[PDB]
Subunit: 113 residues, 8 copies
């Protein structure tokens, strides 16, 4: 269980050392930051697009080295897409989910992919 950055933007404690991944992660932080400012459809579309794209890329990256934790990782992703597709306005959930997903599930592939 990790601290929630304030303002809610990416910081170097989240570095995975995969620059493409890190750059995509910065977009997820920004997407949740927007929602935290105005819970509207522009902001949600933005986060939803970035999230869908990042999850698929990250999944491809795992697949390229036949990563052993793929299936659990993909199910985490798919649950979160699902939350976004049924958005409830729970920004707090979303803030926590991302911090924890990166620092525990994404950090796990470092050095294996």
């Amino acid at each position: 269980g990790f601290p929630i950055p304030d303002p809610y933007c990416w910081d170097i404690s989240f570095r995975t050392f995969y620059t493409i991944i890190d750059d995509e992660h910065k977009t997820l932080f920004n997407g949740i930051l927007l929602l935290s400012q105005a819970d509207n459809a522009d902001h949600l579309n933005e986060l939803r697009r970035c999230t869908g794209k990042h999850f698929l890329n990250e999944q491809q990256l795992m697949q390229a080295s036949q990563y052993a934790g793929y299936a659990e990782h993909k199910k985490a992703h798919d649950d979160f897409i699902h939350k976004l597709d049924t958005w409830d306005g729970d920004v707090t959930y979303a803030k926590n989910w991302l911090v924890n997903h990166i620092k525990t599930i994404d950090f796990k592939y470092r050095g294996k992919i």
Copy 2:
């Protein structure tokens, strides 16, 4: 329900703001324009090739961001391919179908993919 451009060529009211998509759309308008001029096999092959190619590209683009309206969108496409594969010479249908497909189904993905 939208107006049918006369001559039947693309105009900027159809812009999706995805330049690759817009350029492919211009080919669909042209394909239907040809058929409207001479209902023959050259013209139908031309429209059929362009349509098949555009639908698959557009489908790929939706998939890259895990677009939530993919499945309904893909079924729309597949119905229209089917009409082309069983061409009846109904140019009027084709003119309407495209205008409506772009302005209602394609416009829906804007900002999400």
Copy 3:
């Protein structure tokens, strides 16, 4: 002197047998037709984008086979870009230029690239 299509849209007489090239050529007919409908900045941008992109792609295709007419062909393209970049509203010139360029200059690379 080739006939100028009316409406000013691509027809199969302009076929080069290179499908990607033909699809790009459709976009150039469309950009000139829009300007013939309303000579404004939007229509010019559209044509100008499609023309710059088409000229570079066709140039790349020529280079891939070390086409002997490359230099002369690139010069013809560059002269038209210059005309678009100093646009005076002479649609007639443009309509003629495109028909002639495709049917006498582009047609010369067929079978060689």
Copy 4:
């Protein structure tokens, strides 16, 4: 003079309609925000990497359509790289430079590339 966002993160007013460009722009806001939090080498590296990569990608996109404002735009980029490479710690300058570059220089390529 555009307003400087606070927190200094991307918002949808900076949208260019080019999704890859917008995602890169989010990374530049983030790099400046980190420097505003702690002016150190890690934060500078991050911003410097993201800026060099973004400038080259955007340059490539301009070149793909033979964009007429390329040279002037490349010069603006190159001047900012120089500032990052001779970094004096003036975050204020950077915050202003980015907002202005996007809303007056990048916005000018919209519809042309």
Copy 5:
């Protein structure tokens, strides 16, 4: 039913006007020519590699435009791979098969893909 070229090498009557396809076809002719000269494993490996590669590429090309005759076309290919995988030394069959496959099944996709 078409003439069998003598020597068994590609000629321009087999042009599909897809240069990548034509170039791959030249390799198939050569592969059968080798077998006609020495029925050994080097020659068969050569033809088998070229054939496998060409069929898959050609299949991809058909798929990119959602070609309506794909399934019949793919089954033709797969039967011929099968013959090669159970090679009997029937060079005559192979000579006929290729000429007929190109001039009747491959010629069918021209203008549709």
Copy 6:
């Protein structure tokens, strides 16, 4: 049954003549060499990543020419991934497995892919 190089690094007797493949093979030798030096998680992650990546690439290469020995080859690979995913510390096994896999199963595709 082949000799085990000492030190356990690649030598030119393992050349497949596919430079990409050979370069990937050098990484597998190195991965097993590391394990032979310190059986830890860094070393195993390194070998596991390289192995997963190589097997998938090599599998793609086989698929591109519709290689007839694919299925047996893929099952060999998948068994070895499985050993790595249930690592027992048997370095001896791993040393033998690789030498034999290359010199008998990989050497088999030479000239067919």
Copy 7:
């Protein structure tokens, strides 16, 4: 002096072990054989296209490994293009040139690129 194959088609003695290169080389044998059958524009175009494309691809492969013989090799290619571009109908020269180029100049890059 290497033997000139009759019929003038590629055989496995010309193998370079680079499958893409070998497939391109087959096309150059074929282009010369056609000219030996009928010295016309179609046959020349075919050979000229295949030669320009092959020379650029092989050049790119050399550059990818910073091959030390690049400059001298590029010059040999360029001299042959010049001969095709000033074609005098000397098929004999061409038949000899290709056999020699592959077996003494191309063979020298084997293992180095």
Copy 8:
């Protein structure tokens, strides 16, 4: 002065965190080790190919982020190519050069590209 590994193979102390780079670096250790085993043409070719390819790839990665140390880094690479191209059999030099290049010159781009 860094320790020279014995056996002269890559270890995780050389890790750059760029997986493609690390895999290429493994090939350079291997090429020097072979020369240390037998100073012949095969071993030199191997090392020379892997080095030319690695230097160009790493250069491309530097350029993708407009890395500020590019020019100086390219010069260091070019000097080593020159040494390989004028190979005098000084393996000791090579062993030292590689260890030093990676741990002091390559390590400097980490986080910047």
